[PDB]
């Protein structure tokens, strides 16, 4: 197999405090086909200015999606000890066709800090962590999401500077706050702004160590690290499962501004995945260090006929969903974004 590096030296995991109500927030995040945000670009076909209709996995228009955010643990001003995560550990979502996430939209704007409503800081872009498993089972403590057999864990490393992907069988450990251990509440990953995220120093091991404390890694098929790029601009990440291999698409790799999806990595997993988990990451920081955090939003891909318009650059800037809206279905007919006024029968 492939070495996972040194195992956690701490038998007891860091204690976890769950505050779902604080994490919950009210905001509007509706995908728009005309904007073309959340619309994938097909690697298989490249087209010129003329518009064409193609069938591909696409999120339905008007989907708010699932809002996922990470917050700093409860901390005294001198010392940060507790870890804060919403109950997404016990929340399991089926991996029916994969999902697309949007990151950095919140960043570049000032918002109330998630842990403390009174505190307000400029929002900072964050990278989501996704663990996918064919079978998910409840832990001995009774917390859900302890799949154990799950083989597809992707977590950001060096405070999101690089992405780490590995498939391993999770091993339960006996320690305070560990899943098979005493005082088990949740499993989280901690990154520290003062040392781990200090400018010029990024520690991939610190994020890996937090995951190791909760779960040891055994039977590890492969280790993958992608440096990619980090910037405070809107980015889209899409994960899809195909018969040949699991395919990973990132907007940042090709055009960050375009938002178009281009495959950047290929994962050799031929096992069907029926479940996934999102936002298990947590921040370890003092009260002054805490800042508003950007969030990751899940949009489920589904087979969907779509009208696509490609500009002179060739990137799609206009899209129409035939399924949603009678007028949009009429627009798909005649292969025209604008249709002459008429009375038309609909299903």
């Amino acid at each position, epitope marked *: 197999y492939v070495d996972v590096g040194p195992d956690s030296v*701490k*038998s007891a995991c860091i*204690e976890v405090d769950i505050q779902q109500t604080f994490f919950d927030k009210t905001w509007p995040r509706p995908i728009d086909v005309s904007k073309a945000d959340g619309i994938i670009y097909p690697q298989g076909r490249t087209y010129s200015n003329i518009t064409i209709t193609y069938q591909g996995l696409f999120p339905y228009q008007g989907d708010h999606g699932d809002m996922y955010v990470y917050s700093a643990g409860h901390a005294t001003g001198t*010392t940060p*000890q507790k870890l804060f995560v919403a109950n997404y550990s016990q929340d399991v979502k089926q991996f029916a066709n994969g999902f697309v996430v949007r990151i950095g939209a919140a960043a570049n704007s000032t918002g109330t800090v998630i842990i403390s409503p009174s505190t307000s800081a400029t929002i900072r872009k964050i990278y989501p962590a996704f663990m996918l498993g064919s079978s998910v089972g409840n*832990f001995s403590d009774g917390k859900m999401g302890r799949f154990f057999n799950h083989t597809l864990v992707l977590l950001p490393d060096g405070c999101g500077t690089l992405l780490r992907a590995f498939y391993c069988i999770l091993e339960p450990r006996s320690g*305070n706050h560990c899943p*098979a251990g*005493n005082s088990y509440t949740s499993f989280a990953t901690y990154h520290t702004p003062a040392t781990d995220c200090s400018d010029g120093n990024y520690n991939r091991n610190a994020s890996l160590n937090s995951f190791k404390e909760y779960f040891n890694l055994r039977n590890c098929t492969f280790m993958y690290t992608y440096n990619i790029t980090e910037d405070e601009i809107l980015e889209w990440f899409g994960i899809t499962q195909t018969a040949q291999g699991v395919h990973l698409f990132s907007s940042r790799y090709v055009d960050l501004y375009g938002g178009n999806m281009f495959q950047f990595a290929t994962l050799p997993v031929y096992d069907t995945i029926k479940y996934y988990s999102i936002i298990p990451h947590s921040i*370890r920081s003092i009260q002054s260090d805490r800042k508003a955090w950007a969030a990751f939003y899940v949009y489920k891909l589904q087979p969907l006929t779509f009208l696509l318009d490609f500009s002179v650059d060739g990137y799609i800037r206009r899209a129409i969903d035939c399924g949603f809206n009678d007028l949009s279905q009429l627009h798909c007919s005649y292969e025209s974004f604008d249709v002459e006024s008429g009375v038309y029968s609909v299903s």
Partner: antibody, heavy 130, light 110 residues
Framework: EVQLVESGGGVVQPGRSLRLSCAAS????????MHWVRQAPGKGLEWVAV????????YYADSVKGRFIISRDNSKNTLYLQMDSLRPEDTAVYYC???????????????????????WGQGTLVTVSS | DIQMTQTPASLSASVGDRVTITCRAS??????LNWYQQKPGKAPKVLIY???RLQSGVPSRFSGSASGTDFTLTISSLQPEDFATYYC???????????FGQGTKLEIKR
């Protein structure tokens, strides 16, 4: 506020199984691990058995292997310890107590006490005699 | 395994006196050494755990200092109430077993 009460401690014939029950009042037994300590007269307290809050893994002292069985029922709020093949030397006072791991992360010379050893169990004296 | 011996064993200490109680540490692999103050007929009361904290209700005069392989408990302004048996146990993440305490009760000089 937390109260620990121990029952089932009594004089027992040698080689006869005995059941010890520890009950927690106003205590989060479901999310707290339990550590058992035995005191021998004229000697210091020594840990004998630990029951995880999850209860998946239970650890026992090298001297007693399979002699001590620890069962933690969250709904009951009572922890059951089973002692078998008891001997005159084994006679001791058994206390059920909760220990919280002390962890300090020095991001900037930062230390966290992380201590919850308060409300030590009163303990029950069990004598092996006939 | 862990082998722990307290070199003083019993301390003859007068009131308002300074005494040091030294107990050896079996291994430097684990840095967690803790001191427990026990009153006879009563459960032990924690004094120190990571050696960086002072228990609430415990005076500053009681202090725990570890040098090399030996950890010493330093007590000042000793009182008849202060005198008690003391157990120091090594705590190891790798080893499930917890170290026994020899016991160091303090008699009063007269």
């Amino acid at each position: 506020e937390v109260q620990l009460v121990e029952s089932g401690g009594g004089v027992v014939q040698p080689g006869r199984s005995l059941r010890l029950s520890c009950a927690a009042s106003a205590f989060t037994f479901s999310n707290y691990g339990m550590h058992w300590v035995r005191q021998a007269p004229g000697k210091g307290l020594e840990w004998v058995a630990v029951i995880w809050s999850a209860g998946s893994l239970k650890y026992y002292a090298d001297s007693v292997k399979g002699r001590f069985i620890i069962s933690r029922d969250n709904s009951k709020n009572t922890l059951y310890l089973q002692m078998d093949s008891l001997r005159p030397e084994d006679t001791a006072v058994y206390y059920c107590a909760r220990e919280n791991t002390t962890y300090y992360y020095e991001t900037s010379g930062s230390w966290g006490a992380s201590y919850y050893f308060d409300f030590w169990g009163q303990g029950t004296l069990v004598t092996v005699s006939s | 395994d862990i082998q722990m011996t307290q070199t003083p064993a019993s301390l003859s200490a007068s009131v308002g006196d300074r005494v040091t109680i030294t107990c050896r540490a079996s291994q430097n692999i684990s840095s967690y050494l803790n001191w427990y103050q026990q009153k006879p007929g009563k459960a032990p009361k924690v004094l120190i755990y990571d050696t960086s904290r002072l228990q609430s209700g415990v005076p500053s005069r009681f202090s725990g200092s570890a040098s090399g392989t030996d950890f010493t408990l330093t007590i000042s302004s000793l009182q008849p109430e202060d005198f008690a048996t003391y157990y120091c146990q090594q705590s190891c993440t790798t080893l499930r077993c917890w170290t026994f305490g020899q016991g160091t009760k303090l008699e009063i000089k007269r």
